[PDB]
């Protein structure tokens, strides 16, 4: 349809529109017009991405500011889905306006997911792919070939072919998803990664993940190209704190330090050989360093620093090199003694938690390393590695971790902690000491975003309660609200099971993980629900270890044998490729009617973007509250920091963290309003967490289902499925849950 | 073993002193009833 807001015409790509979608678009427009940030919670069963794209695109194409759009999701599959939705919307707009309006919309990702080189795309890790692509595109090979054609160094045809054409003619006008972009770039022998990286500054809407906006290692270069007045959308942003925390966290192991020593020795030998044969490079680098130049002024735009900036751009010192690490040999000795200090600190016999200030003071006492020279470690190492002609950097890969740790610890002092644990795994014959540098404040990484961008939309399907997010991340919202879906008939049945058919309490507490009664009760619940579930059944476990142990117990008891008769069994595995193939097999089994059951981890890879709708997702078994590991030093320190700073109780934060993932898994069942499912939360502890669930799930959770039994839940599930299998009366949803153009006009007239 | 432990060397033995050493009413049915004492 094509309807009108107060002054903004918006073209919806469907003849029908939901009242929730209309209200959501109105609220988003109000937020954009008034300026500031907002928090929106939309039900998972109502089109959210389509409404967001429609309203934002109409806003940008109608108003004269023509503000660009930045879309930030949590996963690459979500980027693909958003790009597909954008392509559909643009197709509708092109069919309605009579012409293809000037528009360019691209996604952005790493080299591993966009490489077409037959010899570089066959790697199992992205770091190696990046290193090889740098070897083929840094310009060293091109310069060597220019000076001497006989040089055996080879180039990348995809990268070379781009120089022939201009940036504005890289791709035709339109929206390019990853699949279409790969097909086009394969047909024309071009590099999609470089196409996107060079067209970000020109696209109307750019779609990427939260890492490309929060992680300073890859965020600075991309952010330097986007506009300052663009709209910012955070889709599925309920789990943004974890990303913000992991952005500025490092872990060092004994193997890492042992490899760093070897890397330092190799660097010293390389410096010696280059000193013997070609020293003018060292002299030139030293001369440039003396004036006060940095990596920005030394490195060309074509090349990149060896060590990614681990701190935010605003926290980098703008002064010249201190002088202690101005020379190659002096810097090498400094780095070597830093590594030795780390090694001698890795010998503690009990957990030690210390602040960066204390660590720096002890360093300055035992050795003579000052804070300022430490702050420049990564930058100096990047310049040195660039100038030493180190085409093979396998030996030097280790020094990156040391540089990152040094530049972080010497940079930040508040909201950061250093934990040294003699036992990385308590269940180990020999000690394996580990040093973790952890960020406790989740607002440090996101402050620059909230200050640089004026209007920020934070939208999600299971972001509740909305009051904590402004508390946890220091930002203020003009409005924060959640929508209640105006269902004509109940389509999803949420229930909580606190005990088994034997009336014995059931829980997923780790200390009682290996309990015959609880394990057998869970297995009986699984079998009974699988017997009645038509096509698909997703089970989410609190942790992978718990899933493994309980599955082994079920295998011994023979419950899996009973499940096999009715459905195939697919299990999530650590290997990402194997998990993806398992997902494909599960979808095929659900489509062909064979019936399948998928076991996964509530905090795993499936729950962070894979969506089960219609035939794929019918019943969701949340086996226990996905509580984090309480006996974790990092989590305990974060809880203490939050209690002291934001006045958030440890129990409250833990319950919020678990309920957030439970709701995340729950919300992957509905796409439209014609989809239905049964959502069983199997734990005695959910009975008091109804107020903590999202509003649209709490409203559907009845008081009689707060504490049920397995048999009674099976009966309710059978009745609910039988009821939902009947044809819906069109009049029951003609104008109460689905609105036509006339109904929308009537709503606008009544409201006005 | 005590001397070996005192010198910090693990002793692979123990002191042997520490080894703790460790009117029936009806009779026409006689010879018929098996003793199902336990289950």
């Amino acid at each position: 349809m094509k309807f009108y807001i107060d002054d903004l015409p918006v073209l919806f790509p469907y003849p029908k529109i939901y009242p929730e979608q209309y209200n959501y678009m109105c609220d988003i427009k109000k937020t954009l017009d008034v300026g500031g940030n907002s928090i929106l919670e939309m039900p998972s069963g109502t089109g959210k991405t389509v409404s967001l794209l429609s309203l934002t695109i109409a806003y940008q194409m109608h108003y004269p500011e023509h503000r660009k759009i930045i879309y930030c999701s949590r996963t690459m599959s979500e980027i693909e889905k958003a790009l597909v939705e954008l392509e559909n919307l643009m197709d509708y707009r092109t069919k309605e306006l009579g012409y293809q309006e000037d528009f360019r919309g691209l996604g952005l990702t790493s080299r591993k997911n966009l490489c077409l080189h037959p010899e570089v795309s066959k790697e199992r890790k992205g770091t190696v792919v990046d290193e090889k692509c740098r070897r083929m595109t840094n310009g060293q090979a091109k310069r060597k070939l220019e000076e001497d054609p006989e040089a055996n160094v080879e180039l990348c045809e995809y990268h070379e072919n781009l120089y022939n054409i201009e940036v504005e003619d890289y791709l035709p006008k339109g929206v390019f998803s990853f699949e279409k972009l790969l097909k086009y770039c394969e047909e024309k022998t071009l590099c999609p990664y470089f196409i996107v990286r060079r067209m970000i500054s020109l696209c109307n809407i750019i779609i990427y993940s939260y890492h490309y906006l929060l992680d300073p290692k890859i965020a600075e270069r991309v952010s330097n190209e986007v506009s300052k007045d663009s709209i910012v959308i955070f889709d599925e942003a309920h789990n943004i704190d974890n990303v913000c925390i992991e952005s500025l966290s490092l872990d060092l192991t004994t193997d890492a330090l042992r490899r760093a020593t070897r890397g330092a020795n190799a660097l010293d030998e390389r410096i010696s050989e280059v000193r013997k044969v070609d020293s003018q490079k060292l002299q030139d680098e030293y001369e440039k360093l003396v004036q006060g130049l940095h990596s920005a002024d030394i490195l060309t735009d074509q090349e990149e620093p060896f060590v990614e900036t681990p701190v935010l751009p605003q926290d980098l010192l703008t002064e010249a090199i201190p002088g202690n690490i101005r020379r190659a040999e002096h810097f090498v000795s400094f780095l070597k003694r830093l590594i030795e200090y780390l090694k001698t600190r890795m010998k503690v016999l009990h957990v030690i938690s210390e602040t960066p200030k204390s660590f720096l003071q002890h360093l300055k006492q035992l050795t003579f390393i000052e804070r300022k020279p430490l702050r420049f470690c990564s930058e100096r190492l990047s310049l040195l590695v660039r100038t030493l002609e180190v085409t093979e950097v396998e030996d030097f890969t280790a020094l990156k971790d040391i540089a990152t740790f040094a530049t972080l610890i010497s940079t930040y002092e508040e909201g950061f902690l250093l934990i040294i644990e003699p036992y990385e795994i308590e269940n180990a014959a020999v000690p394996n000491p580990i040093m973790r540098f952890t960020c406790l404040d989740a607002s440090i990484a996101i402050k620059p975003v909230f200050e640089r961008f004026s209007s920020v939309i934070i939208t999600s399907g299971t972001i509740s309660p909305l009051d904590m997010y402004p508390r946890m991340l220091n930002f203020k919202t003009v409005l924060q609200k959640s929508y209640a879906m105006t269902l004509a008939k109940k389509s999803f049945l949420p229930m909580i099971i606190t005990k088994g058919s034997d009336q014995v309490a059931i829980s997923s507490r780790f200390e009682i993980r290996n309990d015959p009664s609880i394990v057998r009760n869970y297995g009986s619940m699984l079998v009974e629900f699988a017997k009645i579930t038509p096509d698909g059944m997703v089970v989410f476990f609190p942790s992978y270890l718990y899933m493994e142990s309980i599955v082994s117990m079920w295998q011994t008891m023979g419950i899996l044998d009973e499940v096999w008769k009715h459905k195939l069994i697919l299990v999530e595995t650590p290997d990402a490729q194997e998990t993806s193939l398992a997902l494909e097999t599960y979808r095929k089994a659900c489509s062909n009617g064979r019936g399948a059951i998928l076991l996964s981890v509530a905090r795993g890879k499936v729950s962070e973007g894979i969506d089960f709708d219609h035939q794929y997702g019918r019943t969701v078994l949340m086996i226990g509250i996905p509580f984090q590991y309480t006996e974790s030093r990092i989590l305990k320190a974060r809880l203490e920091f939050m209690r002291e700073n934001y006045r958030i109780r440890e129990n409250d934060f833990l319950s919020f963290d678990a309920m957030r993932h439970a709701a995340q898994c729950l919300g992957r069942v509905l796409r439209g309003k014609d989809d239905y499912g049964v959502m069983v939360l199997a734990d005695r502890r959910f009975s008091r967490k109804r107020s903590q669930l999202p509003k649209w799930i709490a409203q559907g959770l009845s008081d009689a289902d707060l504490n049920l039994s397995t048999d009674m839940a099976i009966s309710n599930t059978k009745q609910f499925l039988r009821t939902m299998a009947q044809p819906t009366d069109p009049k029951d949803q003609e104008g109460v849950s689905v609105w036509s153009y006339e109904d929308l006009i009537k709503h606008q007239n009544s409201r006005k | 073993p005590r001397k070996l432990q005192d010198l910090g060397l693990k002793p692979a033995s123990v002191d042997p002193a520490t080894i703790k050493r460790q009117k029936i009413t009806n009779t026409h049915m006689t010879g018929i009833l098996k003793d199902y004492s336990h289950r």
Binding site: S77, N113, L250, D401, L545, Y546, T573, R594, Y629 | -
Partner: protein, 98 residues
């Protein structure tokens, strides 16, 4: 083949045990037979490779495969992979030449 953890105490049969390594090789061959590029919609490898320079805090032992005192795998992941491969093989066998 039943997807049960093998116990070292169990004696087994001498004749049949000769084929265990051949079964390992056959499992590798079947893994290659089943492996193929996956659609970007449900491509989980791309999710982890989206940012190849992610360095944070290593996951707790509850988020990693079970291990024993000696540090080697406990073997419970093997049965999971076995059942997963069984389901995949059945589904693939459905899509035959016929």
């Amino acid at each position: 083949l039943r997807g049960e953890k093998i116990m070292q105490n169990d004696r087994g049969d001498v004749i049949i045990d000769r084929y265990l390594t051949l079964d390992q090789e056959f499992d590798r061959k079947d893994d290659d037979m089943l492996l193929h590029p996956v659609k970007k919609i449900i491509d989980l490898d791309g999710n982890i490779q989206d940012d190849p320079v992610v360095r944070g805090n290593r996951p707790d032992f509850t988020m990693q495969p079970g291990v024993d005192i000696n540090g080697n795998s406990d073997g419970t992941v093997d049965i999971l992979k076995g059942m997963n491969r069984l389901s995949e093989k059945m589904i693939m066998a459905l899509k035959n030449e016929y």
